[PDB]
Each structure stands twice: as C-alpha cells, then as structure tokens.
C-alpha cells in the first residue's frame, strides 16, 4: 500500500543557471520522499511516477526536468516565453525510477520565476505503479 505523493510551492532570490529550483512550502508530502530543503524528490519505492509543475512568470522561463542518482541529467527542457507580461506555464512527465534516483527542476539563464500568494509556482509528483 505505497501511498507516495507530494505538492510543494515556492515562496523564495533570483535563480542561477544550473541551480536546483527549491519548492520550500509543502502542501502534501505523503511518505516524505520530497525534501523541501533540497527541492529534490528521491525515490525510495522503485516504480512509475508522474511529475508535473505549474510556474508563474513575468518573462522568459526555461526549466530542465532532471533525473539521476549523483550526477543527474536533463530528460527534457520546457521553455515558455513572455514579453512584458505575466504568464503561467506547465510541464509533466511519466518516469520510471529506481531506488535512490532523484527528480527535480533545474534553472537556466531564462530565469523569470514567480512564487507568491496570487501567483504561485508548484512542483508535484505521485506514484502510479510500484515495481
């Protein structure tokens, strides 16, 4: 009965290229596999997971969705641009994960990311099937 699910928002400082994007405010964290201090989900139960985010922004934003166990690599990059305006963008991915593998979002030079009441950014994930 593996009940694994997290949702965390960001309330935080301008992000640097290659910096892990921390979502510091936990809404949900069943099984405690997301760590708000690091911004990383770490797989304890091998299986299939869905990851998803929604990011508020006031300019150009690209984010790398990362997977790995010490040296992570980008699976995909999502970009959504905005000229002198406010936007919300989204990305998602089904991933097979093994024990110890982390999943997280990583910043780029395109770093317009807002995290506030009234313009939230959220990172979520859940177990689909263990194995």
């Amino acid at each position: 009965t593996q009940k694994i699910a997290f949702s965390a928002t960001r309330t935080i400082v301008p992000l640097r290229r290659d910096q892990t994007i921390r979502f510091d405010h936990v809404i949900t964290n069943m099984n405690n596999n997301y760590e708000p201090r690091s911004g990383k989900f770490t797989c304890k139960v091998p299986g299939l997971y869905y990851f998803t985010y929604h990011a508020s922004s006031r300019g150009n934003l690209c984010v790398n969705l990362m997977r790995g166990r010490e040296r992570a690599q980008k699976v995909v990059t999502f970009c959504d641009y905005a000229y002198n305006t406010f936007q919300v963008t989204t990305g998602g991915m089904v991933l097979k994960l093994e024990q110890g593998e982390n999943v997280f979002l990583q910043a780029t030079d395109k770093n317009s990311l807002l995290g506030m009441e009234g313009a939230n950014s959220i990172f979520s994930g859940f177990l689909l099937f263990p194995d």
Binding site: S7, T28, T85, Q87, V88, A119, S124
Partner: protein, 129 residues
C-alpha cells in the same frame, strides 16, 4: 462506489462573474457525481489523496484560484491581449469525507476562448484512505 473521477467543462461563451466560483456546467465523465454541476463544487465521498488539475482558455487576463474547504490553496494567472492562451494549474490534496473543492476567479475573470479552445477541470482519487 469506491473510486472517484471527473472531467467537467465550461460550455458557454460568457465568462464567470468577477470574484466568483467558476461553474463547469458540462460533464465529460463524472460517474460518482462527485462534481456537482449545479453548485460548481466537488465534494469528497471517498477520503484519500486526490489530484486536481485544470486548463482554462482565455482571451483577456485570467487568474484561477483553487479552494479547499474555504481556504485558497493555489492561484495561477495568465495575461493576454485579444489572442488566446491556456491557463493551467493543479495540486495534490489529501481530503476527508465532506470536504469541498472548487475553482474561482478574482478581478481577472476572462474565460472566453476562441473557437476550438475550451476550459476543463479534472480530479481523481489516487490513494484511498
């Protein structure tokens, strides 16, 4: 009886009132009747962990707010002039029996999509407790 799933849609060319609950009047699927199209609210029958997500089309500014039992959980805003975009948002919530979930707009209330651009709200139980 023991599961929970819905996808509802807002089939109308007229936007919500400012600062009001968004009613999704049409049903794609809603087998347990957990979303009530007459009130615009989801009410939990089976307690446990739910995923909620929406994609809303708009041709002027739109903020969508998700509420749980009277408290604002998350807000996402998209600004546009004349042209059409999709505002999305979503969250995972562990709910007790009787808890209500709904979407609302603030002063940015536009949900007027162009032809072929619609608005949808989905939810489903992933882990019963």
């Amino acid at each position: 009886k023991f599961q929970s799933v819905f996808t509802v849609t807002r089939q109308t060319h007229q936007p919500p009132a400012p600062n009001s609950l968004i009613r999704f009047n049409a049903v794609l699927t809603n087998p347990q009747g957990d979303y009530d199209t007459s009130t615009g609210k989801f009410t939990c029958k089976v307690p446990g962990l739910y995923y909620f997500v929406y994609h809303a089309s708009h041709t002027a500014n739109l903020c969508v707010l998700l509420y749980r039992s009277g408290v604002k959980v998350v807000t996402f805003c998209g600004h546009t002039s004349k042209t059409n975009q999709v505002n999305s948002g979503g969250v995972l919530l562990r709910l007790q029996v009787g808890e209500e979930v709904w979407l609302a707009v603030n002063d940015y209330y536009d949900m007027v999509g162009i032809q072929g651009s619609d608005s949808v709200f989905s939810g489903f139980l992933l882990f019963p407790d």
